[PDB]
Design a protein around this ligand. Structure first.
Ligand SMILES: *C[C@@](*)(O)[C@H](CCCNC(N)=[NH2+])NC(=O)[C@@H]1CCCN1C(=O)[C@H](N)Cc1ccccc1
Lengths: 258, 27
């Protein structure tokens, strides 16, 4: 997370950490939407251009973490995966169109002060809130900077990072990149003449883009961190998977079996 | 069905240090 700030304890109870069995590594963020279902980005699990192909087997899942590095004894829960469901039409070949996957845990989890699911938006809620200039929030344990080049400062946070970013007018989004954009996407962050900065980065995918309802003082997952070009660059914006456009498949996989 | 309400915050009728910002952008 670029230019964010240390998250408060229990501030983002659905935050999930995708973790590699060996080598032990943080792969992505993810979120809790039930005590059995987890939502992330598909490129987190499968990205052939880079030799990426993780099976249920290769990973762990950590719910309740704050510290990135340290094992929080009676707070965190390490779960194993039963299944992985990737959108049949996720386009890894070109623009990462439909960058979504679902993970159902081996056994349910029990909610606590640090473990609590987030809502998925309804028709009403999507529409009411997915307005340009409306601010959402991002959380992660990803890169504090563009790490593939020589830089000063630490490259990764010790604790959960949080950033609050405005939604941008598609046209702005559209014109900001040579990458083919789609209805399943939305770009967010500040404009070079706003004076505020911030963005998500490498290691942030799968993390939620959440919004609070003025209507029911409830948090909803509107986006999934997806892709971007560098991090916190002027005249560029981060791209997030459009959760509302994807609910249909979402619900379909979630309710299949009883 | 209990989703999006935080124990240490909404469960507590408490607020996070920067959620107003968000509430303030929603026209
Ligand atoms: C998965 C990730 O953690 C990461 C998130 C990047 C978000 N960036 C910003 N600034 N908010 N995603 C990626 O790194 C993805 C996966 C593969 C390439 N990629 C990119 O973001 C590239 N930088 C650009 C790109 C290449 C191909 C298709 C889509 C985007």
């Amino acid at each position: 997370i670029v230019e964010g700030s240390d998250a408060e304890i229990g501030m983002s109870p659905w935050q999930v950490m995708l973790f590699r069995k060996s080598p032990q590594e943080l792969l992505c963020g993810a979120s809790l939407i039930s005590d059995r279902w987890v939502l992330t980005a598909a490129h987190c699990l499968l990205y052939p251009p880079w030799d990426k192909n993780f099976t249920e087997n290769d990973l762990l899942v950590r719910i309740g973490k704050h510290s990135r590095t340290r094992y929080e004894r009676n707070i965190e829960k390490i779960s194993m995966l039963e299944k992985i469901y990737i959108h049949p039409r996720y386009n890894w070949r070109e623009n990462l169109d439909r960058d979504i996957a679902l993970m159902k845990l081996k056994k349910p989890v029990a909610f606590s002060d640090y473990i609590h699911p987030v809502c998925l938006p309804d028709r009403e809620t999507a529409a009411s809130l997915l307005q340009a200039g409306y601010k959402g929030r991002v959380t992660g344990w990803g890169n504090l900077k563009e790490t593939w080049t020589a830089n000063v400062g630490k490259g990764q946070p010790s604790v959960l990072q949080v950033v609050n970013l405005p939604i941008v007018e598609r046209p702005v989004c559209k014109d900001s990149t040579r990458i083919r954009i789609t209805d399943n996407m939305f770009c967010a962050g500040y404009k070079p003449d706003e004076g505020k900065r911030g963005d998500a980065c490498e290691g942030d995918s799968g993390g939620p883009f959440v919004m609070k309802s003025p209507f029911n003082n409830r948090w909803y997952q509107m986006g999934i961190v997806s892709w971007g070009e560098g991090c916190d660059r002027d005249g560029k914006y981060g791209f997030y998977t459009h959760v509302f456009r994807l609910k249909k498949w979402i619900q379909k996989v979630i309710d299949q079996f009883g | 069905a209990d989703c999006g309400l935080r124990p240490l915050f909404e469960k507590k009728s408490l607020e996070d240090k920067t959620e107003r910002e968000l509430l303030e952008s929603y026209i």
